[PDB]
Amino acid sequence: MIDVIMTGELLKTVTRAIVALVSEARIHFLEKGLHSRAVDPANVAMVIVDIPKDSFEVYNIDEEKTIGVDMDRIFDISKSISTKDLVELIVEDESTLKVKFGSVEYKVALIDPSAIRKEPRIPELELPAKIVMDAGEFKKAIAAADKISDQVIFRSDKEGFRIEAKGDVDSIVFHMTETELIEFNGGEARSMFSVDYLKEFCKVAGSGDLLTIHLGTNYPVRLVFELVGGRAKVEYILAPRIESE
């Protein structure tokens, strides 16, 4: 009889990150906490969200059950739930999901977890560069590149982490030596991506949070955010745009 209670900002962060690529994903209530991973219909990006049980103001499961949650209606209802308005999720039945907050109890029906596209096996990626920086400084690097182009270049070496965008009349570069990055392993990496997705990922995160970036050469990029003050871990994996010769 799932009976969880999280803060409003917590539910609003995950539902947004998820529904940011899907409209219905399977949510996994495990012993270690809440899990849920999905790829967009396009098959370009992947999101993996984790909420260990210590982020909830209570997390009561009576067996690890998976539920098919209609992410759109959930996200849509979430725009009511307040930031401080504790929300309690309950699934004491098999057909519906009760969402309680304030004097409102919303009840949306559940989906057959196996009725939704089966999620993607979490990749086993081995990437050269590992950059740890602030999500805000990052979100500002993406916002800037969006005015110059549809794509950007993540360039890593020993002299720091670089993100570059070029237009036919201008260019922009976001550089942070290892000395200004929270962490940096200095590995050499270089992959190009579409600002479109990168800008969409940046929505579920703001300044003040941290971000680890796993970059390789002509490989996808892993964007692991510590959201809601380290209470929610949202990872976005974007496929690269390969330089066609």
């Binding site: 098959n43 990626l125 745009r241 330089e243």
Partner: peptide, 11 residues
């Protein structure tokens, strides 16, 4: 030029 790839190649 550049071609957006898919995640299927890496999974």
């Amino acid at each position: 030029k550049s071609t957006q790839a898919t995640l299927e190649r890496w999974f």
